[PDB]
Design a protein around this ligand. Structure first.
Ligand SMILES: Cc1cc(C(=O)Nc2cnn(C)c2)no1
Ligand SMILES: Cc1cc(C(=O)Nc2cnn(C)c2)no1
Ligand SMILES: Cc1cc(C(=O)Nc2cnn(C)c2)no1
Ligand SMILES: Cc1cc(C(=O)Nc2cnn(C)c2)no1
Lengths: 265, 263
């Protein structure tokens, strides 16, 4: 991978692995999400982060995901090369945004796009806060100054408000627990595991006859490594749409909410 | 990746990913096992496969009986690891796939692995010995003189593993596979079982020790709607005896041993 000519974005090529594909011999949405995080991490590393800035480390501040939105037109096949381009942008004092564009390396055609919203949080108290001027200035030298959006459209799906699923759910998958492979180097649950957990309550017949086109996921609280999660799904809809809810198995505390759009094969 | 000059082995380089590493910022044993499977699949693809022409005609498949991995150094995040793999026929008992892991910068061996595979009818699930026709089709891609990742006589890779006796010292109960744990054929990936075994090791051992050797026997498959219990007992460096069994009837799916060195 490498930063582009202007140094305001980063590109990386990936060869789709045997264990990374599902029943159709194409990459799963979880493989796609892992590749997005890997290119994001390589971009941060290339511009001097380790994505905490100097001011963030001084004040015990970290970036946490608030929302992930992914739209896939074509999933790459096993052995195919996918090229991903990524960049960041400051959204004033609200937080930051990281965008991605996925392309077929052979045809050069856009096969997917993604966007994510990040908020500042104190690592110890877990208290959200606005972005300060000092942090904003350190981030701006690595971001394009004119807006560059993966989802530019007027009333686009990436910014839609998601409602809370009402009990009883149509479908559910109960007692989901993370294992060591689900944790990151800091022993926190990887953001991609939550996408997997959401998808667990989709019936196997929908997965067998449809392809996932769009997923929007809101992140409210973290799942600890000793927590247990219940995944709830209700059909809201040629296309199938679902409303999702992840909550702790015990007290029913919300950890995530989301929506998925599926197209018949 | 590519087949070597003689065409009897295959090499591939991998850059260790951010999500592939644990608390020490080095690859997990599960990342290592996934890379072993990936280079194995790329080798089979390069030589025309891992079912052969005779196997497809008779509804036959290769199934793992045993996996043995020894790691001297786990590669760090961003490091490049080179893996070399090759296959060998073991008469009519089955086949063996071996691996050598190296640091791409130093050229030093950082790990080695070996696996035993048995023939099975994919419909009846009945094991069988390798026939002459299949043996002949495999031999043109394997070295004819023995080449072993673990050549030493009476070594760890061939040791008989006993069955853990109840009560276990430690346990992790109610483990279930999710869709990410399945392969393209909707079967549980062999690497998931390694993860499940390791789940019953206490976090303090993981935090203060590095895993040096893991030997795992595969007895029966876990279906996607099955639930597993992972059991561990200290037998000792720290050594453990492991057992994976179904949560309901207690049917054995795996047994194994792990050896850990203090950091
Ligand atoms: C899915 C998905 C994407 C990311 C992501 O961008 N992660 C990131 C960006 N910069 N750094 C240092 C890490 N995490 O989960
Ligand atoms: C607001 C708000 C809180 C959280 C939160 O703690 N959850 C979480 C899960 N993974 N990451 C990186 C953060 N996210 O948004
Ligand atoms: C761990 C581990 C290694 C393998 C392995 O070699 N898999 C293999 C070999 N040939 N093909 C086509 C697949 N499976 O799990
Ligand atoms: C003898 C014998 C049977 C099995 C078996 O069915 N288990 C299993 C799990 N994953 N694979 C590929 C096979 N293993 O050894």
């Amino acid at each position: 991978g490498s930063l582009t000519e202007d140094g305001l974005s980063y590109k990386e090529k990936f060869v789709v692995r045997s264990y990374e594909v599902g029943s159709n011999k194409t990459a799963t949405v979880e493989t796609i999400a892992n590749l997005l995080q890997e290119v994001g991490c390589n971009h941060a590393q290339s511009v001097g982060f380790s994505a905490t800035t100097t001011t963030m480390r001084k004040l015990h501040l970290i970036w946490v995901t608030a929302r992930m939105h992914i739209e896939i037109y074509k999933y790459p096949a096993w052995g195919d090369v996918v090229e991903i381009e990524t960049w960041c942008q400051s959204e004033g004092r609200i937080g930051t945004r990281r965008d991605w564009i996925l392309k077929d390396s052979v045809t050069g055609e856009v096969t997917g796009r993604a966007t994510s919203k990040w908020v500042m949080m104190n690592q110890d108290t877990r208290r959200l806060q606005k972005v300060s001027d000092d942090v904003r200035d350190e981030y701006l030298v690595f971001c394009p100054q004119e807006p560059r959006l993966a989802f530019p459209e007027e009333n686009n799906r990436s910014l839609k408000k998601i409602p809370k699923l009402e009990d009883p759910a149509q479908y559910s998958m109960i007692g989901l627990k993370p294992r060591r492979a689900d944790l990151d180097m800091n022993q926190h649950v990887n953001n991609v595991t939550y996408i997997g957990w959401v998808l667990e309550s989709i019936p196997q017949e929908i997965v067998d006859t449809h392809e996932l086109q769009v997923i929007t996921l809101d992140y409210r609280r973290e799942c600890q490594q000793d927590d247990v999660v219940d995944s709830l799904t209700t059909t809201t809809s040629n296309d199938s749409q679902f409303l999702h809810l992840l909550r702790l198995s015990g007290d029913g505390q919300e950890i995530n909410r989301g929506t998925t759009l599926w197209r018949k094969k």
